[PDB]
Structures are given as structure tokens and as C-alpha cells.
Design a protein around this ligand. Structure first.
Ligand SMILES: Nc1nc2c(ncn2[C@@H]2O[C@H](COP(=O)(O)OP(=O)(O)O)[C@@H](O)[C@H]2O)c(=O)[nH]1
Ligand SMILES: [Mg+2]
Length: 170
């Protein structure tokens, strides 16, 4: 089979995980999507000449059983860590997601991309500099996105694939 990349989108409720995923997969902005629905979505794409499958889990937070969270973190190859640029708590929550994924995977080297979503809004509490400082500290890319306008969306997901590739080559 062509290569499949198992991607996981994490972040506080309301940051735009579902909107980002639907924009990536379907090329539409869906502005209302039940915050409690967690599902996976698939898309066949070409990234840097490679035809591959993206298998993307749009997470929604607590699970019936914590074992289910641990399972998707172990299975997942790369993580989009999403905050919203107008929600400081969502940015602070990134520290927890970074930790928890590393902890479950028992790894110091987990492909991740920091994503600051809702960049179409002038209303902003997290400046680009602050997010760059966090991404620098993690040694990962940082991309500002808008699920609404599609700015940065392919970049976020494709950059995460490229980070998975760099991890694999070791
Ligand atoms: N302006 C704007 N609103 C967004 C964007 N992404 C999501 N939203 C809105 O933010 C809210 C939460 O989005 P949702 O995709 O449900 O977030 P999730 O809980 O992380 O899955 C909804 O009201 C969306 O319309 C974006 O890039 N720009
Ligand atoms: Mg959602």
C-alpha cells in the first residue's frame, strides 16, 4: 500500500481542530461542528511528489477510558498541537499536550507542529513572538493558520508529514 501517515490533532476545546481538519480534507469551512465528536478522516494527497494517505484523528478531549487516549497517542505518528491566537488558556494548555504525548509514547522525539489558529481575527492575546518562543523551546515548527480562509492549513499538515519523515530516517 502507499504510505499512510497517522496524524493526530490535539488542543483545547474551541481552538478549531475540527474546522482545520475539515478544511484540509474537504476544502470547506464548517463553522459549527459539535465540540464533543471525535473521529478520524482520510485523504489521499501528493506531498513533495509522494502519493500518500493522511489518516487524521480530530480529537475531542477526555475519552470513555484513559486507555483510549493512550492508544491513539501511541498509534499516532505526529501531532498538531493547536491553540487559538485569541485564547491564552488554549496556549497555556499546549504545555500539557506536549508533556502528555511524550509521556505516553515514552519518547523525547515525537513529531509535532505548533499551530496558532484563527489568524483571520485581529483580536489576539497570543503574539507571534510568544508562540515562536515556545516552538523554539520545543525544537518544532510553528505555523499560524486560519481554518476560515484556509491560510496555512496545507502547510500545517504537510509540515507535520515532513517532520514524521525526518524522524523515520534516523
Ligand atoms: N474566525 C475563525 N473562527 C474559527 C476558526 N477555526 C474555528 N473557528 C470557530 O471556532 C469555534 C470552534 O471551532 P471547532 O472547529 O469546533 O473547534 P474544536 O473544538 O477545536 O474542534 C467555532 O465557532 C468555529 O467556527 C478560524 O480559523 N477562524
Ligand atoms: Mg471538534
Amino acid at each position: 500500500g502507499m504510505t499512510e501517515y497517522k496524524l493526530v490533532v490535539v488542543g483545547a476545546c474551541g481552538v478549531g481542530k475540527s474546522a482545520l481538519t475539515i478544511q484540509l480534507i474537504q476544502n470547506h469551512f464548517v463553522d459549527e461542528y459539535d465540540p464533543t465528536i471525535e473521529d478520524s478522516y482520510r485523504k489521499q494527497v501528493v506531498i513533495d511528489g509522494e502519493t500518500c494517505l493522511l489518516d487524521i484523528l480530530d480529537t475531542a478531549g477526555q475519552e470513555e477510558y484513559s486507555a483510549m487516549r493512550d492508544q491513539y497517542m501511541r498509534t499516532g505518528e505526529g501531532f498538531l498541537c493547536v491553540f487559538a491566537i485569541n485564547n491564552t488558556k488554549s496556549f497555556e494548555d499546549i504545555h500539557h499536550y506536549r508533556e502528555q504525548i511524550k509521556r505516553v509514547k515514552d519518547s523525547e522525539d515525537v513529531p509535532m507542529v505548533l499551530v496558532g489558529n484563527k489568524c483571520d481575527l485581529p483580536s489576539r492575546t497570543v503574539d507571534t513572538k510568544q508562540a515562536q518562543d515556545l516552538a523554539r523551546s520545543y525544537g518544532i515548527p510553528f505555523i499560524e493558520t486560519s481554518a476560515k480562509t484556509r491560510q496555512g492549513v496545507d502547510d500545517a499538515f504537510y509540515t507535520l508529514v515532513r517532520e514524521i519523515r525526518k524522524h523515520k530516517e534516523k
